[PDB]
Amino acid sequence: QPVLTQPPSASGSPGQRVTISCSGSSSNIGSYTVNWYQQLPGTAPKLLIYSLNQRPSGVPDRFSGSKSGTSASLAISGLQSEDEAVYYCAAWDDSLSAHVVFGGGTKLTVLGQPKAAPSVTLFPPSSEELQANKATLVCLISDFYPGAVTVAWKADSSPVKAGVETTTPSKQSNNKYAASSYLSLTPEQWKSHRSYSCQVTHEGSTVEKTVAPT
Amino acid sequence: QVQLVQSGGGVVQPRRSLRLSCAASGFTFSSYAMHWVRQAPGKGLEWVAVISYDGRNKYYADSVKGRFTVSRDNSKNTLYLQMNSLRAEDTSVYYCARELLMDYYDHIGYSPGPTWGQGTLVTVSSASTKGPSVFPLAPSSKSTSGGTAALGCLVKDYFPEPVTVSWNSGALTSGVHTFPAVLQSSGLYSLSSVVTVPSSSLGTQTYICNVNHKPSNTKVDKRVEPKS
């Protein structure tokens, strides 16, 4: 509940309807109204929907809000290219430690070119770095569209979360997207496993690359 | 026109302070509750605080309780955020926003309304000028597919941005991709630059990454070759 739950991303083609969900609990969405905000790159958020279903002037009537129980939903009829943005829901929460609670945001892509799976290159630690008593795995992720991926690392077959730093996808010059993820290990950790993998998930498909000690 | 204008952002160290202000015009500021909301680079919105119209009631995000204080001066149509006891994770763009309705109701609570400022960036960091360590990312069978090999340079642990990378002093540009940097928990940046080249050249052609970090007046030229 510290963050209302929204899907990280969504997409649709021009003309389609899309819906974006926002899940909370009885102390927020169950008891208080939900607002939605639209944010374009490098600009402040804009109020899109207030009091669950009302639009400020200057907001197209293809945007609408609804609520049922502890979930709320933003619907966009007839997607247009300018609807590509990040959408946030928010509600007052009257728990102990009352506060405004935002959802985590949903990046909506309005599809304007073909889906493109990421190219992934994974480099192991260099011998020079290992001699500095450090070890960095480098997972480079490029040429994907839409611009949303999740990255998961494995030591052998087990999830690794510690020591991971991943960038937020950024547009390339060709309007596809790039990101990178770095796994920091000790030299000992690196040599004590048979392999490490970087798995990139994009629009439901996974691309995995694996490296092993020399 | 109806607007809010934030000021006061800048670069500061942790365990220090910074004071933000937000100057309202074109609406009756003194009749509205006011919010602060923040957003870390590449991340989501996070509510920081709200203050009632008369300043009598304040509420805060748990993470800033004991550290930040919201206040207002209605005579000056100004909202303040006094950010004491700064921490690195307070790095964000800070927005002020007007409450939705003029008065307070039971089924509404508080929520950011239609008027938002432009944001002011606060960067909290204890890092200081440092040039990068550069490591080769050697080409290998595993970075080779379809007559093209990938190789690169890892530019590690520098501050502040930016770094520039060229290959072979500009003689290699096709297939070069220098990725945006990651900001590590340490407060230092790292990035990688990768080039795709015909596998055919890995013997004859020399590959040198040229790394320039102007902020520290550091320049590194590193040859990247197949392992041994």
Coordinates of C-alpha atoms in Angstrom, one line a residue:
Chain A
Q1 CA 0.0 0.0 0.0
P2 CA 2.9 2.5 0.1
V3 CA 2.4 2.5 -3.7
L4 CA -1.0 1.8 -5.3
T5 CA -0.3 -0.9 -7.8
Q6 CA -0.3 -0.1 -11.6
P7 CA 1.1 -2.1 -14.5
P8 CA 4.5 -0.7 -15.3
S9 CA 3.6 -0.4 -19.0
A10 CA 0.8 -0.6 -21.5
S11 CA 0.4 -0.2 -25.2
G12 CA -2.1 0.0 -28.0
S13 CA -2.4 1.1 -31.6
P14 CA -4.1 4.3 -32.7
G15 CA -7.9 4.0 -32.4
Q16 CA -7.9 1.2 -29.8
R17 CA -9.2 1.5 -26.3
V18 CA -6.9 0.8 -23.5
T19 CA -7.4 0.6 -19.7
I20 CA -4.9 1.1 -16.9
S21 CA -5.7 -0.4 -13.5
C22 CA -4.8 1.0 -10.1
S23 CA -5.1 -1.4 -7.1
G24 CA -5.2 -0.2 -3.5
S25 CA -7.0 -1.0 -0.2
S26 CA -9.9 0.0 1.9
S27 CA -8.0 2.8 3.5
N28 CA -7.3 4.6 0.2
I29 CA -9.3 3.7 -2.9
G30 CA -11.9 2.0 -0.8
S31 CA -12.6 5.3 1.1
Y32 CA -11.4 8.2 -1.0
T33 CA -11.6 9.5 -4.5
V34 CA -9.0 8.7 -7.1
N35 CA -7.2 11.2 -9.3
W36 CA -5.2 10.5 -12.5
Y37 CA -2.3 12.5 -13.8
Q38 CA -0.6 12.4 -17.2
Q39 CA 3.1 13.2 -17.5
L40 CA 5.1 13.9 -20.7
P41 CA 9.0 13.7 -20.8
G42 CA 10.6 16.5 -18.9
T43 CA 7.4 18.2 -17.9
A44 CA 5.3 18.5 -14.8
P45 CA 2.4 16.1 -14.3
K46 CA -1.0 17.4 -15.5
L47 CA -4.3 16.6 -13.7
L48 CA -6.3 14.3 -16.0
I49 CA -9.2 13.0 -14.0
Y50 CA -10.5 14.1 -10.6
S51 CA -13.1 12.9 -8.2
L52 CA -13.0 9.5 -9.9
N53 CA -14.7 10.5 -13.2
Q54 CA -14.4 14.3 -13.9
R55 CA -12.2 16.0 -16.5
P56 CA -10.6 19.4 -16.2
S57 CA -11.1 21.7 -19.1
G58 CA -8.4 20.9 -21.8
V59 CA -8.6 17.2 -21.2
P60 CA -10.1 15.2 -24.1
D61 CA -13.3 13.4 -23.4
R62 CA -11.7 10.1 -24.5
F63 CA -10.2 9.9 -21.0
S64 CA -12.5 8.4 -18.3
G65 CA -12.2 7.1 -14.8
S66 CA -14.0 4.4 -12.8
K67 CA -13.7 2.6 -9.5
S68 CA -14.9 -0.7 -8.1
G69 CA -14.1 -1.8 -4.5
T70 CA -10.4 -1.2 -3.9
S71 CA -9.4 -0.9 -7.6
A72 CA -9.7 2.1 -9.9
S73 CA -9.3 2.2 -13.7
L74 CA -8.4 4.8 -16.4
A75 CA -9.9 4.2 -19.8
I76 CA -8.7 5.9 -23.0
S77 CA -11.1 5.5 -25.9
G78 CA -9.7 5.9 -29.4
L79 CA -5.9 6.3 -28.7
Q80 CA -4.1 9.1 -30.4
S81 CA -0.4 9.5 -30.7
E82 CA -0.3 12.4 -28.1
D83 CA -1.6 10.0 -25.5
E84 CA 1.8 8.5 -25.2
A85 CA 2.8 9.4 -21.7
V86 CA 3.2 8.1 -18.2
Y87 CA -0.1 7.9 -16.2
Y88 CA -0.3 8.0 -12.4
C89 CA -3.2 7.3 -10.1
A90 CA -3.3 8.9 -6.6
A91 CA -5.6 8.8 -3.6
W92 CA -5.6 9.9 0.1
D93 CA -4.9 7.1 2.5
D94 CA -6.2 7.4 6.1
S95 CA -4.0 4.7 7.6
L96 CA -1.8 5.4 10.5
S97 CA 0.4 7.9 8.9
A98 CA -2.2 9.4 6.6
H99 CA -0.7 10.5 3.3
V100 CA -1.4 10.9 -0.4
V101 CA -0.4 7.6 -2.1
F102 CA 0.6 7.5 -5.8
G103 CA 0.7 4.5 -8.0
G104 CA 4.0 3.6 -9.5
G105 CA 3.1 4.9 -13.0
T106 CA 2.2 3.2 -16.2
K107 CA 4.2 4.0 -19.4
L108 CA 1.7 3.9 -22.2
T109 CA 3.1 3.6 -25.7
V110 CA 0.9 4.4 -28.7
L111 CA 2.4 2.0 -31.3
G112 CA 3.9 3.8 -34.2
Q113 CA 6.4 1.4 -35.5
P114 CA 6.7 -2.4 -35.4
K115 CA 7.5 -4.3 -32.2
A116 CA 11.2 -4.8 -31.9
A117 CA 12.8 -7.3 -29.5
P118 CA 15.9 -6.3 -27.6
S119 CA 19.4 -7.1 -28.7
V120 CA 21.3 -8.2 -25.6
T121 CA 25.1 -8.4 -25.1
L122 CA 26.5 -9.6 -21.8
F123 CA 30.2 -9.2 -21.0
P124 CA 32.0 -10.9 -18.1
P125 CA 34.4 -9.1 -15.8
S126 CA 37.7 -8.3 -17.5
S127 CA 41.0 -9.8 -16.2
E128 CA 42.1 -6.2 -15.4
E129 CA 39.1 -5.6 -13.1
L130 CA 39.5 -8.9 -11.4
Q131 CA 43.0 -7.9 -10.5
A132 CA 41.7 -4.8 -8.9
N133 CA 39.7 -7.1 -6.7
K134 CA 36.4 -6.2 -8.4
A135 CA 34.0 -7.9 -10.8
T136 CA 31.3 -6.2 -12.9
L137 CA 29.0 -8.0 -15.4
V138 CA 27.7 -5.7 -18.1
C139 CA 24.4 -6.4 -19.8
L140 CA 23.7 -4.1 -22.7
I141 CA 20.2 -3.9 -24.1
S142 CA 19.3 -2.1 -27.3
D143 CA 17.0 -1.6 -30.2
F144 CA 13.8 -2.4 -28.4
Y145 CA 10.3 -1.1 -28.9
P146 CA 8.1 -0.4 -27.0
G147 CA 10.6 1.1 -24.5
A148 CA 9.9 -1.1 -21.5
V149 CA 11.9 -4.1 -20.2
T150 CA 12.5 -5.9 -17.0
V151 CA 15.9 -7.4 -16.2
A152 CA 16.5 -10.4 -14.0
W153 CA 19.9 -11.8 -13.1
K154 CA 20.8 -15.4 -12.2
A155 CA 23.8 -17.0 -10.5
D156 CA 23.6 -20.5 -12.0
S157 CA 19.8 -20.8 -11.8
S158 CA 19.2 -18.7 -8.7
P159 CA 17.9 -15.1 -8.6
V160 CA 20.4 -12.4 -7.7
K161 CA 19.1 -9.0 -6.6
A162 CA 22.0 -7.6 -4.5
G163 CA 24.5 -5.5 -6.5
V164 CA 22.2 -4.9 -9.5
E165 CA 22.0 -1.4 -11.0
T166 CA 19.8 -0.9 -14.1
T167 CA 19.2 2.2 -16.1
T168 CA 15.8 3.4 -17.1
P169 CA 15.2 2.9 -20.9
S170 CA 16.1 5.9 -23.0
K171 CA 15.3 6.6 -26.6
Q172 CA 17.9 6.0 -29.2
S173 CA 18.2 8.2 -32.3
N174 CA 16.2 5.6 -34.3
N175 CA 13.3 5.9 -31.8
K176 CA 13.9 2.5 -30.4
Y177 CA 15.2 2.2 -26.8
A178 CA 18.3 1.2 -25.0
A179 CA 19.1 0.2 -21.4
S180 CA 21.9 -1.3 -19.4
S181 CA 22.2 -3.4 -16.2
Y182 CA 25.3 -4.0 -14.1
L183 CA 25.9 -6.8 -11.7
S184 CA 28.6 -6.2 -9.1
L185 CA 30.2 -9.2 -7.6
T186 CA 33.3 -10.1 -5.7
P187 CA 35.9 -12.0 -7.6
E188 CA 35.2 -14.9 -5.3
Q189 CA 31.5 -14.9 -6.1
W190 CA 32.3 -14.7 -9.8
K191 CA 34.5 -17.8 -9.7
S192 CA 32.4 -19.8 -7.2
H193 CA 29.5 -20.2 -9.7
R194 CA 29.4 -22.0 -13.0
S195 CA 27.7 -19.2 -14.8
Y196 CA 25.7 -16.0 -14.5
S197 CA 22.9 -14.9 -16.7
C198 CA 21.1 -11.7 -17.6
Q199 CA 17.5 -12.2 -18.7
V200 CA 15.6 -9.4 -20.4
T201 CA 11.9 -9.6 -20.7
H202 CA 10.1 -7.5 -23.3
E203 CA 6.5 -7.7 -24.3
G204 CA 6.2 -11.2 -22.7
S205 CA 9.3 -12.6 -24.5
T206 CA 12.6 -13.3 -22.8
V207 CA 16.2 -12.9 -24.1
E208 CA 18.8 -14.5 -22.0
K209 CA 22.6 -14.3 -22.3
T210 CA 25.0 -16.3 -20.1
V211 CA 28.7 -15.9 -19.2
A212 CA 31.1 -18.1 -17.3
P213 CA 34.5 -17.7 -15.5
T214 CA 37.7 -18.4 -17.6
Chain B
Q1 CA -2.3 33.6 -15.4
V2 CA -2.6 30.9 -12.8
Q3 CA 0.8 29.5 -11.9
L4 CA 3.3 28.3 -9.4
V5 CA 7.1 28.9 -9.7
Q6 CA 9.5 26.9 -7.6
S7 CA 13.0 28.1 -6.8
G8 CA 15.9 27.1 -4.5
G9 CA 17.1 23.8 -6.0
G10 CA 20.7 23.1 -6.5
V11 CA 23.5 20.7 -5.6
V12 CA 24.1 20.0 -1.9
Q13 CA 25.8 17.5 0.4
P14 CA 24.0 15.1 2.7
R15 CA 23.7 16.1 6.3
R16 CA 23.1 19.7 5.1
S17 CA 20.1 21.8 4.3
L18 CA 18.3 23.5 1.5
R19 CA 15.2 25.7 1.3
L20 CA 12.7 25.6 -1.5
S21 CA 10.1 28.2 -2.3
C22 CA 7.1 28.3 -4.6
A23 CA 5.6 31.7 -5.6
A24 CA 2.0 31.6 -6.5
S25 CA 0.2 34.0 -8.7
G26 CA -3.2 34.4 -10.5
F27 CA -5.4 32.7 -7.9
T28 CA -6.3 33.0 -4.3
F29 CA -3.4 31.1 -2.7
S30 CA -4.5 31.8 0.8
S31 CA -7.7 29.8 0.2
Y32 CA -5.9 26.6 -0.7
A33 CA -4.0 23.8 0.8
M34 CA -0.7 23.2 -0.9
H35 CA 1.4 20.1 -1.7
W36 CA 5.0 19.2 -2.4
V37 CA 5.5 16.2 -4.6
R38 CA 8.9 14.9 -5.8
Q39 CA 10.3 12.6 -8.5
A40 CA 13.7 11.0 -8.7
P41 CA 15.2 10.8 -12.2
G42 CA 13.6 8.0 -14.2
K43 CA 11.3 7.1 -11.3
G44 CA 7.7 7.8 -10.2
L45 CA 5.9 10.5 -8.3
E46 CA 6.2 10.6 -4.5
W47 CA 4.1 12.8 -2.3
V48 CA 6.2 14.8 0.2
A49 CA 3.8 17.0 2.3
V50 CA 0.6 19.1 2.4
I51 CA -0.1 22.3 4.4
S52 CA -3.6 23.6 5.1
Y53 CA -4.6 27.1 3.9
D54 CA -3.9 28.7 7.3
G55 CA -0.8 26.7 8.0
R56 CA -2.3 25.1 11.1
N57 CA -2.2 21.5 9.8
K58 CA 0.7 19.8 8.1
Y59 CA 1.1 16.1 7.0
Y60 CA 4.3 14.5 5.8
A61 CA 5.6 11.4 4.0
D62 CA 7.1 9.1 6.5
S63 CA 10.5 9.3 5.0
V64 CA 10.8 13.1 5.6
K65 CA 9.2 13.3 9.1
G66 CA 11.7 14.8 11.4
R67 CA 13.7 16.3 8.6
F68 CA 11.6 18.4 6.3
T69 CA 9.2 21.2 7.3
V70 CA 6.5 22.7 5.1
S71 CA 5.4 26.3 5.8
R72 CA 3.7 29.2 4.0
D73 CA 3.5 32.9 4.0
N74 CA 0.1 34.0 2.6
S75 CA 1.0 37.7 2.6
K76 CA 3.8 36.8 0.1
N77 CA 1.7 34.0 -1.7
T78 CA 4.6 31.7 -1.1
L79 CA 5.0 28.1 -0.1
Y80 CA 8.2 26.8 1.5
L81 CA 9.9 23.4 2.0
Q82 CA 12.8 23.5 4.5
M83 CA 14.8 20.4 3.7
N84 CA 17.0 19.7 6.7
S85 CA 19.0 16.6 7.4
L86 CA 19.4 15.9 3.7
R87 CA 20.0 12.4 2.5
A88 CA 21.2 11.2 -1.0
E89 CA 17.8 9.6 -1.7
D90 CA 16.2 13.0 -1.4
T91 CA 17.6 13.7 -4.8
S92 CA 14.6 14.6 -7.0
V93 CA 12.8 17.2 -8.8
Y94 CA 10.4 18.9 -6.4
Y95 CA 7.0 20.2 -7.5
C96 CA 4.5 22.3 -5.7
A97 CA 0.9 21.7 -6.5
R98 CA -2.3 23.3 -5.4
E99 CA -5.0 21.2 -3.7
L100 CA -8.0 20.3 -5.8
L101 CA -10.8 22.1 -3.8
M102 CA -10.7 25.2 -1.7
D103 CA -12.0 23.5 1.4
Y104 CA -11.6 20.2 3.2
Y105 CA -14.1 17.3 3.1
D106 CA -14.4 13.8 4.5
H107 CA -14.7 11.7 1.3
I108 CA -11.8 13.6 -0.4
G109 CA -9.0 14.0 2.1
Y110 CA -6.2 15.9 0.3
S111 CA -5.0 15.4 -3.3
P112 CA -2.9 17.3 -5.7
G113 CA -5.0 19.4 -8.0
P114 CA -4.7 21.1 -11.4
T115 CA -2.1 23.7 -10.8
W116 CA 1.5 22.5 -10.7
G117 CA 4.8 24.3 -10.8
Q118 CA 7.6 23.5 -13.2
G119 CA 9.8 21.7 -10.7
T120 CA 13.2 22.5 -9.1
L121 CA 16.0 19.9 -9.1
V122 CA 17.7 19.1 -5.8
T123 CA 20.8 16.9 -6.1
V124 CA 22.2 15.5 -2.9
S125 CA 25.6 13.9 -3.2
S126 CA 28.8 13.6 -1.3
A127 CA 30.8 12.7 -4.4
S128 CA 33.5 14.9 -5.8
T129 CA 35.4 15.2 -9.0
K130 CA 36.9 11.8 -10.0
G131 CA 38.0 10.4 -13.3
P132 CA 37.0 7.0 -14.6
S133 CA 38.7 3.6 -14.5
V134 CA 38.5 2.1 -18.0
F135 CA 38.3 -1.7 -18.6
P136 CA 38.3 -3.5 -21.9
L137 CA 35.2 -5.5 -22.9
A138 CA 36.9 -8.0 -25.1
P139 CA 35.3 -9.5 -28.2
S140 CA 34.6 -13.2 -27.9
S141 CA 32.8 -16.0 -29.7
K142 CA 29.9 -15.1 -27.3
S143 CA 29.8 -11.5 -28.5
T144 CA 29.9 -12.7 -32.2
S145 CA 27.0 -13.5 -34.4
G146 CA 26.6 -13.3 -38.2
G147 CA 30.1 -12.1 -39.1
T148 CA 29.9 -9.2 -36.6
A149 CA 31.6 -9.1 -33.3
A150 CA 30.8 -6.8 -30.3
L151 CA 33.5 -5.3 -28.2
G152 CA 33.6 -2.4 -25.8
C153 CA 34.9 -0.3 -23.0
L154 CA 33.5 -0.1 -19.4
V155 CA 34.0 3.4 -18.0
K156 CA 33.7 2.9 -14.3
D157 CA 33.3 5.1 -11.2
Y158 CA 33.5 8.7 -12.3
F159 CA 32.0 11.9 -11.2
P160 CA 30.3 14.1 -12.3
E161 CA 28.8 13.6 -15.7
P162 CA 29.6 13.7 -18.5
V163 CA 32.1 11.4 -20.2
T164 CA 32.5 11.2 -23.9
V165 CA 33.8 8.1 -25.7
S166 CA 35.1 7.9 -29.3
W167 CA 36.7 4.9 -31.1
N168 CA 39.9 5.1 -33.0
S169 CA 39.9 8.9 -32.6
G170 CA 36.7 9.1 -34.6
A171 CA 37.7 6.7 -37.4
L172 CA 35.1 4.2 -36.1
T173 CA 31.6 5.5 -35.9
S174 CA 29.3 3.0 -37.6
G175 CA 28.1 0.4 -35.1
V176 CA 29.2 2.5 -32.1
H177 CA 26.7 2.7 -29.2
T178 CA 27.6 4.6 -26.0
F179 CA 25.0 3.9 -23.4
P180 CA 23.6 6.3 -20.9
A181 CA 25.3 6.0 -17.5
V182 CA 24.1 4.3 -14.4
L183 CA 24.3 6.2 -11.1
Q184 CA 25.5 3.6 -8.6
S185 CA 24.6 3.5 -4.9
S186 CA 28.2 4.8 -4.3
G187 CA 27.3 8.1 -5.9
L188 CA 29.6 7.5 -8.9
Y189 CA 28.6 6.9 -12.5
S190 CA 29.5 4.1 -14.9
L191 CA 28.8 3.7 -18.5
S192 CA 29.7 1.4 -21.3
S193 CA 30.5 2.0 -25.0
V194 CA 30.2 -0.9 -27.4
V195 CA 31.0 -1.2 -31.1
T196 CA 29.9 -3.9 -33.6
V197 CA 32.6 -4.6 -36.2
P198 CA 33.1 -7.1 -38.9
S199 CA 34.6 -10.2 -37.2
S200 CA 37.0 -10.1 -40.2
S201 CA 38.8 -7.1 -38.7
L202 CA 39.6 -8.5 -35.2
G203 CA 43.0 -9.5 -36.4
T204 CA 44.1 -6.6 -38.6
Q205 CA 42.2 -3.7 -37.2
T206 CA 43.2 -2.1 -33.8
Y207 CA 40.4 -0.9 -31.6
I208 CA 41.0 1.9 -29.1
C209 CA 38.5 3.6 -27.0
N210 CA 39.2 7.2 -26.3
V211 CA 37.6 8.3 -23.0
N212 CA 37.4 12.0 -22.1
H213 CA 36.2 13.2 -18.7
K214 CA 36.5 17.0 -18.9
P215 CA 35.3 17.6 -15.4
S216 CA 38.5 16.0 -14.1
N217 CA 40.6 16.8 -17.1
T218 CA 41.3 13.0 -17.5
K219 CA 41.8 11.3 -20.9
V220 CA 42.3 7.6 -21.3
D221 CA 43.1 5.7 -24.5
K222 CA 42.6 1.9 -24.1
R223 CA 43.2 -0.8 -26.7
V224 CA 40.6 -3.5 -26.6
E225 CA 41.6 -6.8 -28.0
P226 CA 40.6 -10.5 -27.9
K227 CA 41.5 -12.3 -24.6
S228 CA 44.5 -14.5 -23.9

